[PDB]
Amino acid sequence: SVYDAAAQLTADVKKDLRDSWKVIGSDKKGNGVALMTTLFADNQETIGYFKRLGNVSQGMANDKLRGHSITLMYALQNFIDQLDNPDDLVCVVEKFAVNHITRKISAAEFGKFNGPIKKVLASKNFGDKYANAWAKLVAVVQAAL
Amino acid sequence: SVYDAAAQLTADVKKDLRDSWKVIGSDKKGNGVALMTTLFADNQETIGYFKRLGNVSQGMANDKLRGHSITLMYALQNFIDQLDNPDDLVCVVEKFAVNHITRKISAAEFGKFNGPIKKVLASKNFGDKYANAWAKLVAVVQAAL
Ligand code: HEM
Numbered sequence: 001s002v003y004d005a006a007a008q009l010t011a012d013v014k015k016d017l018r019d020s021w022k023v024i025g026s027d028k029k030g031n032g033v034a035l036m037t038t039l040f041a042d043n044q045e046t047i048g049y050f051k052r053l054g055n056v057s058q059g060m061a062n063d064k065l066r067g068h069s070i071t072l073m074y075a076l077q078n079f080i081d082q083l084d085n086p087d088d089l090v091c092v093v094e095k096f097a098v099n100h101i102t103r104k105i106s107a108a109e110f111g112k113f114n115g116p117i118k119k120v121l122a123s124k125n126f127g128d129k130y131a132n133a134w135a136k137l138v139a140v141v142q143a144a145l
Numbered sequence: 146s147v148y149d150a151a152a153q154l155t156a157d158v159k160k161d162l163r164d165s166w167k168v169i170g171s172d173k174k175g176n177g178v179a180l181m182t183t184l185f186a187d188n189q190e191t192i193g194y195f196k197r198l199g200n201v202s203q204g205m206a207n208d209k210l211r212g213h214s215i216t217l218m219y220a221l222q223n224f225i226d227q228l229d230n231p232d233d234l235v236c237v238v239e240k241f242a243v244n245h246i247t248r249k250i251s252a253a254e255f256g257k258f259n260g261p262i263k264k265v266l267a268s269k270n271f272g273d274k275y276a277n278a279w280a281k282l283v284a285v286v287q288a289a290l
């Protein structure tokens with residue numbers, strides 16, 4: 001149950017999520033593109049899902065990839081803002097899941113995003129503890145897929 | 146031309162958008178639902194598009210509607226944050242349009258949102274000047290449909 005997953009977000013986890021987000025969420029365009037590029041670099045098999053974005057190897061220069069990257073960050077912003085109210089976190093997560101389910105994205109595939117997040121966090125000096133906190137937030141979405 | 150539409154967002158318009166957003170964007174859940182219910186009350190002919198959300202008449206009590214309403218506000222948040230850079234504003238507006246275009250929503254359909262926005266702004270003491278500023282932002286999205 002998505003609600004049960006939301007329980008893993010204890011006070012210390014929510015704190016690490018907010019503190020780290022204050023940084024990685026402060027440069028959505030730069031960090032958003034870094035996440036996407038890292039995803040394509042380490043998981044080439046996921047490139048096929050984003051054919052609409054054109055040539056993703058262009059990075060920042062690709063307007064379509066840039067628009068998708070910036071927008072992706074606002075979905076994370078939404079999750080972070082709803083942390084203190086499980087009911088709101090749950091309804092936004094389920095809404096979010098709808099489009100991804102239609103694209104046939106399984107819970108395991110979605111889990112591939114954990115790697116990119118871990119590296120982006122590290123680039124900002126946030127270690128394993130923070131990556132584990134984010135893995136738990138990602139787990140909430142997986143509970144809905 | 147989306148770019149010519151975006152060029153209509155002058156210093157004064159951007160300032161008015163920011164000032165009004167500071168207030169309405171501070172309660173995304175409340176104002177988001179108010180916007181959606183005003184849309185359904187004033188333009189019943191649009192309800193058919195949100196069949197997945199169930200009984201939208203329930204307002205805040207409808208979890209699906211609540212999740213959608215909060216999420217909608219983050220798209221507006223995204224647009225406001227890109228006001229400094231027209232190139233970034235345009236790329237997120239076009240990314241945003243993709244799903245609506247797939248749903249067959251036309252520019253005429255999208256312009257119906259001007260009414261609900263004007264009414265919500267007014268309930269917060271923001272008059273004509275602000276409603277006109279938001280209509281210019283909506284025109285940018287329309288140019289992309
Ligand atoms: C932190 C994780 C993720 C977040 C926050 C996220 C966010 C988003 C957002 C906000 C959209 C735009 C609205 C929509 O159409 O759904 C989107 C689109 C999409 N996402 Fe996700 N996503 C995530 C992970 C993934 C993963 C791991 C995959 C697949 C490997 C995936 C595949 C897609 C695809 C194919 C699209 C459509 C892109 C297009 O064709 O323009 N997403 N995602």
Ligand code: HEM
Pocket residue numbers: 095098099191194195197198213216217218220221241244245248250254255256257258
């Ligand atoms: C200021 C204007 C609007 C904003 C900011 C907005 C924002 C959003 C967002 C963020 C989503 C979720 C991502 C996606 O699926 O694309 C969405 C979904 C949707 N929008 Fe829009 N939208 C706007 C106007 C409209 C209008 C006027 C219509 C139709 C007349 C419409 C119909 C839909 C539908 C049917 C969905 C899917 C709802 C669901 O099943 O969850 N939107 N919109």
